[PDB]
Design a protein around this ligand. Structure first.
Ligand SMILES: O=C(O)CCc1ccc(-c2ccc(O)cc2)cc1
Ligand SMILES: [Cl-]
Ligand SMILES: [Cl-]
Ligand SMILES: [Cl-]
Ligand SMILES: [Cl-]
Ligand SMILES: [Mn+2]
Length: 340
């Protein structure tokens, strides 16, 4: 039977089932006021699927110059053609190779650049903005989005959306690395998985994706959604409550010290965006600081709602295209205020 919603993370995460249901706000707003993230699927069924394919981005924009990041060692690959990224998205034998002769796990940096998404891609902009869930919160002019309504005493978000494009992490050693490192945003955000690429050549990558999700602390219901082979898993997230940010900073200052970093006692390891919390660091955070997070597997068409101030990190399981919009809910406006 069709249902309005279900629970993940042992009851701690709301999962809404119908992205366009006008009653979603009634269930959403209680979880959101408590500082929890929220998951919505089925957003892929609302989109024009031909607009969000890697082959179309290559054909239409392939000649633009970009930088890439090597996710395994953070090296920057400067001033290459965006087609050099898109043509290896799902075919491993087309990927740029590191000096060891291995195909690289790459992230496309700042593309489209700054606030240019709407200008470069007006049909994609329309298709996304018209199908965002919780539209009173997430649209530029939604009645519960204060972005356009606030004075300069508040940090306002950039004009979005922003697109996040990266290959999936592959090996047992890749389990300890992030696609996006631990950081926080002063605005709220919704992140939609619009495309998941499951590769070929080295296309027998069944078991290590399962081990990554299990070691990632994914709940029993999430594990049932994986065993059921009906939906493509894109990325593993860890999200922490905004109120736990300083305890995470204390852990990371202590680990930096143990590892011989030489850092002023006030320096901000979350703002540095230099850490990924692996299985060891997540266990230590729980045991030594009493901090529990949310381990979330974002499937194709899942929209992840990230509360303002909530530290978070992303680990791609397969090749992903994600599109994110920032907004300012009245529930969390304190996080962007410039005084006390
Ligand atoms: O079980 C595995 O192979 C590893 C995890 C996983 C789980 C599900 C899929 C999948 C689902 C729907 C589909 O059309 C194609 C693929 C892929 C990967
Ligand atoms: Cl809060
Ligand atoms: Cl377009
Ligand atoms: Cl709404
Ligand atoms: Cl990063
Ligand atoms: Mn973020």
């Amino acid at each position: 039977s069709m249902t309005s919603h279900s629970w993940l993370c042992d009851g701690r995460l709301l999962c809404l089932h119908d992205p366009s249901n006008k009653n979603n706000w009634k269930i959403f707003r209680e979880c959101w006021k408590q500082g929890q993230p929220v998951l919505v699927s089925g957003v892929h069924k609302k989109l024009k699927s031909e607009l969000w394919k890697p082959e179309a981005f290559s054909q239409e924009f392939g000649d633009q110059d970009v930088d890439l990041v090597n996710c395994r060692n953070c090296a920057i690959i400067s001033d290459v053609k965006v087609r050099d990224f898109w043509d290896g998205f799902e075919i491993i034998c087309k990927r740029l190779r590191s000096e060891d002769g291995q195909p690289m796990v790459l992230k496309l940096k700042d593309w489209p650049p700054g606030e240019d998404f709407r200008d470069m891609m007006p049909t994609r902009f329309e298709d996304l903005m018209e199908n965002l869930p919780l539209p009173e919160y997430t649209k530029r002019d939604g009645r519960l989005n204060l972005a356009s309504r606030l004075p300069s005493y508040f940090v306002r978000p950039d004009l979005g959306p922003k697109m996040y494009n990266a290959y999936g992490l592959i090996t047992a050693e890749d389990r300890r690395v992030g696609t996006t490192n631990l950081h926080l945003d002063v605005s709220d955000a919704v992140n939609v998985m619009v495309y998941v690429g499951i590769p070929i050549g080295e296309g027998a990558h069944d078991e290590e994706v399962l081990k990554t999700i299990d070691e990632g602390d994914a709940d029993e219901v999430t594990k049932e959604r994986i065993h059921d082979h009906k939906e493509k898993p894109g990325a593993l997230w860890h999200i922490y409550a905004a109120k736990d940010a300083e305890k995470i900073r204390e852990l990371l200052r202590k680990v930096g010290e143990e590892q011989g970093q030489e850092n002023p006692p006030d320096h901000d390891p979350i703002h540095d965006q230099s850490w990924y919390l692996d299985q060891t660091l997540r266990k230590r955070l729980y045991e030594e600081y009493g901090v529990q997070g949310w381990a979330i597997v974002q499937f194709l068409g899942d929209a992840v709602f990230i509360p303002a101030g909530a530290p978070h990190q992303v680990h791609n399981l397969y090749s992903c295209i994600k599109v994110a919009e920032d907004f300012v809910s009245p529930e969390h406006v304190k996080h962007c205020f410039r005084l006390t």
